Write a protein that binds this ligand. Structure first.
Ligand SMILES: [Mg+2]
Lengths: 216, 126, 34, 365
């Protein structure tokens, strides 16, 4: 070959573009700003879905609650209106770290960390909280924490094993006879190893994407 | 094409001619065209009744089990085929759709009886 | 049949965009009217 | 109410403080914000410490604002917040202290219970019970009724203001109700139990007239409907308690008035927040009114009602118990001053070491 030649402009372009992105990174106060009259984000002009309109006007964001508290409410419990409506069992975050967006003129945007207790079951380690910019958060009062966090677990009744599908069960029993295994045991699937979380379970915020800084 | 991202999937690739559909069950990268590059062919589906009135599905269940064990997703039509065969449980919407059809025919039967009763009133009027 | 409390939980979640509640479906497929 | 010793500033004024010209320190902070660089907590601390005039307070207020809207807002020190309130009181700028306290979100002034008592007591002695009430409402919003001393002062201001205010707006009922309830819960005396029943009654009024979301929205209160049920439980508890506890007659009349008023009245944020199966509170009022009369009869039968007014009972409680609290709080105050002195020295030492290393870095560079 040897007629393939360098592309200096292409190499120059890639580096130069990436540098500008780091320099002109937007802030949470801009990416997640909202126009409450039209319920549209000014940055990208993204109009919120319809099922969220009522809560956008009727509920608060997390750091709106935390900006009013000493130490940004470290140690306090916070729940979500969506959880309160969906699950009878206590679901909340125990705040451990909180990084406000200083640029915001009210310190109403930022990130938080805490320990999750979902449907009464508590995780062992703290992780970053997702959906902090949602109008869904409700701070728990200190005097109501004990009654709020009181939970008694019920014995689990969801089946641990189920039958095999009709054809797949016949293929298993047929193989038994072929190999000489004589038995009348019913093939059973074990569901304990593969149990699904609820769909609204908090997700890993650390590995989540962030919107770009090009305005629409 | 040189794809970036995506996963292997088991789906139906449409073949045949106009008004004569025929499907090839295949394992293919999800971003490839419906009838384009695939990894393995896992069977076929003929949706038209044959001389005996039988719709013919062929499933290579050994290779299908291999690709599901390696992360291959399933398209919703293919999940319906595996449920009818008995290799998978019946899909939730297969049952829900069957329930909707039952509630929809019950109304039709009731309406016909009401019409017959209304027709009976016409018979009473003579 | 869903529990009564769960049917109320869904009536609150989707308040204002609801359909008439459906009961248990017919036990068999109703014979096609002809 | 508090003694002169509690409000004496000899100990704070005798603190060891570094002497830095405000002009020089002002320049250092101004440069950092222009370069979008973080400012040290020790820097803002030195500014507040070296305030020497009424005019200087205005400049410090601007820099406290700038610090709040900076990367190191979380590191504002407790002694810096306490010195701010002490400086404001010293130079006559009490309005400024209350202003920053009410606008905590902007300036970051979150005082401790001792500092709250210092500001609240100034207004009480001057007779400005409107400003003192503002301090009480700010304490309630932060749920900071932990120290016993603050609870007694807050209840004295609340009951004195309530007696004057014959007419209460729905916002006033909500604010007074929350302040009474949270302060009352801490106290197990007759005055404490009366304030719980008084607080639940007022909040119950707002729940059955304007909805439950008026009570809990933006308030340190629960969102579950049934505040009048909590009030009646207080009556049922005192009546059946083995120990002899008494509820002031004044509160019982308030609950009777609330039940009568509610019983016989004359953009897209419109949601039904309660399940259809659960009974609405309005339907339960007939049963609530029967419980009240039965509880009142049992209480009067057992002689568990205190004819004395709540303002007179609270005054006696403050006189008897507040003196002891002053000694305890003042002892803790001295310990805090020494703890703050040591922590401040550590920060000053750490700053000196890094600056010395900075010279070594430039020497290497
Ligand atoms: Mg989602």
């Amino acid at each position: 070959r040897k007629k393939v030649r360098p592309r200096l402009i292409a190499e120059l372009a890639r580096r130069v573009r990436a540098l500008r992105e780091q320099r002109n990174q937007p802030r949470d106060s801009q990416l997640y700003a909202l126009d409450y009259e039209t319920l549209t984000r000014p940055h990208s002009g993204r109009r919120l879905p319809v099922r969220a309109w009522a809560d956008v006007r009727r509920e608060s964001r997390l750091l709106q609650l935390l900006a009013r508290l000493p130490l940004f409410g470290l140690g306090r419990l916070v729940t979500r209106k969506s959880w309160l409506w969906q699950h009878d069992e206590p679901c909340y975050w125990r705040l451990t770290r909180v990084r406000p967006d200083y640029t915001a003129q009210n310190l109403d945007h930022g990130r938080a960390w805490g320990i999750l207790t979902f449907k009464g079951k508590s995780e062992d380690t703290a992780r970053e909280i997702e959906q902090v910019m949602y109008h869904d958060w409700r701070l728990v009062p200190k005097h109501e924490e004990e009654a709020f966090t009181a939970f008694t677990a019920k014995p689990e009744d969801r089946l641990n094993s189920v039958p095999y599908p009709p054809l797949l069960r016949a293929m298993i029993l047929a193989e038994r006879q072929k190999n000489g295994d004589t038995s009348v045991q019913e093939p059973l699937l074990n569901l304990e190893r593969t149990r699904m979380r609820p769909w609204d379970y908090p997700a890993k915020q650390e590995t989540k994407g962030r919107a770009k800084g090009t305005p629409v | 094409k040189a794809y970036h991202g995506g996963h292997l999937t088991i789906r139906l690739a449409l073949g045949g001619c106009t008004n004569r559909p025929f499907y090839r069950i295949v394992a293919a990268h999800n971003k490839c065209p419906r009838d384009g590059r695939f990894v393995e062919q896992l069977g076929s589906y003929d949706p038209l009744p044959n001389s005996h009135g039988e719709k013919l599905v062929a499933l290579n269940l050994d290779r299908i089990r291999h690709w599901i064990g390696c992360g291959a997703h399933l398209s919703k039509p293919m999940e319906k085929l595996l449920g009818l065969s008995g290799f998978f449980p019946l899909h939730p919407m297969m049952i829900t759709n069957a329930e909707r059809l039952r509630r929809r025919r019950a109304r039709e039967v009731l309406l016909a009886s009401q019409k017959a009763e209304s027709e009976a009133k016409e018979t009473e009027a003579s | 049949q869903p529990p009564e409390r769960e049917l109320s939980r869904l009536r609150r979640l989707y308040q204002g965009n609801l359909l008439e509640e459906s009961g248990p479906p017919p036990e068999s497929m109703p014979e096609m009217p002809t | 109410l508090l003694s002169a010793a509690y409000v004496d500033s000899h100990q704070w004024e005798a603190r060891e403080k570094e002497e830095y010209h405000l002009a020089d320190l002002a320049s250092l902070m101004d440069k950092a914000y222009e370069r979008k660089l973080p400012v040290s907590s020790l820097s803002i601390s030195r500014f507040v410490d070296n305030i020497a005039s009424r005019e200087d307070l205005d400049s410090a207020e601007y820099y406290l604002y700038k610090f709040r809207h900076s990367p190191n807002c979380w590191y504002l020190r407790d002694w810096t917040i306490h010195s701010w309130i002490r400086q404001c009181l010293k130079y006559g700028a009490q309005d400024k202290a209350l202003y920053t306290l009410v606008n905590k979100v902007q300036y970051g002034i979150f005082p401790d219970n001792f500092t709250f008592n210092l500001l609240m007591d100034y207004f009480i002695k001057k007779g400005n019970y409107k400003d003192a009430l503002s301090v009480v409402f700010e304490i309630m919003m932060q749920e900071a009724f932990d120290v016993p001393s603050t609870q007694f002062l807050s209840l004295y201001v609340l009951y004195r203001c309530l007696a004057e205010k014959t007419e209460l707006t729905w916002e006033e009922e909500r604010d007074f109700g929350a302040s009474l309830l949270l302060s009352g819960l801490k106290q197990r005396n007759t005055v404490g139990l009366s304030s719980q029943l008084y607080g639940y009654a007022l909040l119950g009024k707002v729940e059955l007239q304007r909805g439950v979301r008026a009570v809990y929205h933006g308030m340190p209160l629960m969102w579950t409907p049934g505040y009048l049920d909590r009030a009646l439980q207080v009556m049922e508890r005192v009546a059946s308690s083995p120990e002899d506890l008494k509820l002031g007659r004044e509160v019982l009349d308030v609950l009777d008035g609330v039940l009568k008023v509610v019983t016989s009245p004359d953009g897209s944020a419109n949601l039904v927040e309660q399940l259809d199966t659960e009974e609405p509170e309005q339907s339960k009022l007939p049963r609530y009114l029967e419980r009240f009369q039965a509880s009142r009869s049992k209480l009067q039968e057992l002689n568990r009602v205190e004819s004395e007014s709540l303002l007179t009972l609270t005054t006696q409680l403050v006189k008897e118990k507040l003196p002891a609290c002053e000694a305890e709080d003042l002892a803790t105050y001295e310990q805090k001053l020494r703890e703050w002195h040591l922590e401040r020295v550590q920060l000053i030492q750490r700053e000196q070491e890094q600056r010395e290393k900075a010279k070594q870095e430039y020497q290497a560079l």
